[PDB]
Amino acid sequence: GELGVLRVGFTASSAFNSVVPTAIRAFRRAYPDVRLQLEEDNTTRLADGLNEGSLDVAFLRPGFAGSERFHLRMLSEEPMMIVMAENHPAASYEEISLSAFRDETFLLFPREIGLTLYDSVIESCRTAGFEPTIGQLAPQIASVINLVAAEMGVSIVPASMSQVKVIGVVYRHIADQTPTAKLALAYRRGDTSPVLRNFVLTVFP
Amino acid sequence: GELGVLRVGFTASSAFNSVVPTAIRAFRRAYPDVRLQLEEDNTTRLADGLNEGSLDVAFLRPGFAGSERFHLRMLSEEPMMIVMAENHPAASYEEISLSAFRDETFLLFPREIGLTLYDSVIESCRTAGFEPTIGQLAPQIASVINLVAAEMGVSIVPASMSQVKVIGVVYRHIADQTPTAKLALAYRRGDTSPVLRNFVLTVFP
Numbered sequence A, B: 001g002e003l004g005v006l007r008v009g010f011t012a013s014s015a016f017n018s019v020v021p022t023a024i025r026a027f028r029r030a031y032p033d034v035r036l037q038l039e040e041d042n043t044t045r046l047a048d049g050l051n052e053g054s055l056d057v058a059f060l061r062p063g064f065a066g067s068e069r070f071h072l073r074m075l076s077e078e079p080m081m082i083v084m085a086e087n088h089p090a091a092s093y094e095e096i097s098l099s100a101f102r103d104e105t106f107l108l109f110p111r112e113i114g115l116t117l118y119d120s121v122i123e124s125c126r127t128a129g130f131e132p133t134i135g136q137l138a139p140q141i142a143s144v145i146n147l148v149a150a151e152m153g154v155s156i157v158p159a160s161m162s163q164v165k166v167i168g169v170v171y172r173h174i175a176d177q178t179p180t181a182k183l184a185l186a187y188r189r190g191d192t193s194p195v196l197r198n199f200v201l202t203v204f205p
Ligand SMILES: C=C(CC(=O)O)C(=O)O
Pocket: A011, A012, A013, A014, A041, A042, A043, A044, A060, A061, A109, A113, A114, A115, A117, A118, A140, A141
């Protein structure tokens, strides 16, 4: 499996986690004659792509319905952080608890694209003792961060999204809970393709 | 047109330009009873969405084939910048000329999603006197930046993408040419909807 093409998907936020570019670069160097066709889409779409054979492997968020039909190998777990406007009152706090936002508007992406990550944001607020008020939905976490800059609310994001230094936003660690965003390598059961095997073994030497 | 829904599209990179969140927030405050349905997609898809009626207005890049069928109002022009790995030899230069990359690999997004921006990157290199070697394609400019962090090549991006401070990349202004990335508000000709009118007049008071 030194020649051919591999269709590799990942979520938009997952690309900001170092494991994704690290794996892509490592595979390209070890197997230069395998063309990587890269697709950026959310976990719901990536799982469907794996199921229908339009993707060969994906960096996605584990836990979705039917995930037991695929192989899932954990690649990164990272804390979740609050993103807020620089002038938000909580930005002056020495320690940030989620209860400070019990009456704040949360911006999010539409649940249907990534149920597990969306639900983990809601449950984080529930663990802090409140039902969050969800305001404007935006398509991706980067889109949400840009609306946070316009003071439309706050959000909770994978820690690696703190690289997205939109002017006028700040990222803070959460004093509660330690909610975590998870990234796994996903691929079909009983797909014995040697190219896929070479990719999986590159990601997990 | 104080009630209803407006379907608003924008490209993933365009959200990092302040005009997009500024306009969305201003409209939401002036017309709270109009629901904004936000879609993030590239200029090719946004133009098709406007044509088929699945979008009402878009922040897109002007110049595409058939653009004369729509209204296009310029909203922002910004310089384009080089994004490269922090350890690239040109990162030490006092002034950055595109000819320094004449033998470097350029990473880009697939041309079909945004012909005008893609072609402006190629022509920038041509104006500098070389045909660029295009390496790995990634789906969006943010995806490309993350691969630049893995030292897979360099790219040219709208200046506002310099907010995307992926660890291990740097952004530099270009000594040549002044290549510019353009953002326009696009909507259908002869669409007399009062909600759309209210949005357009919010963006251009
Ligand atoms: C918005 C999401 C959630 C998902 O696709 O699982 C992401 O960027 O990872």
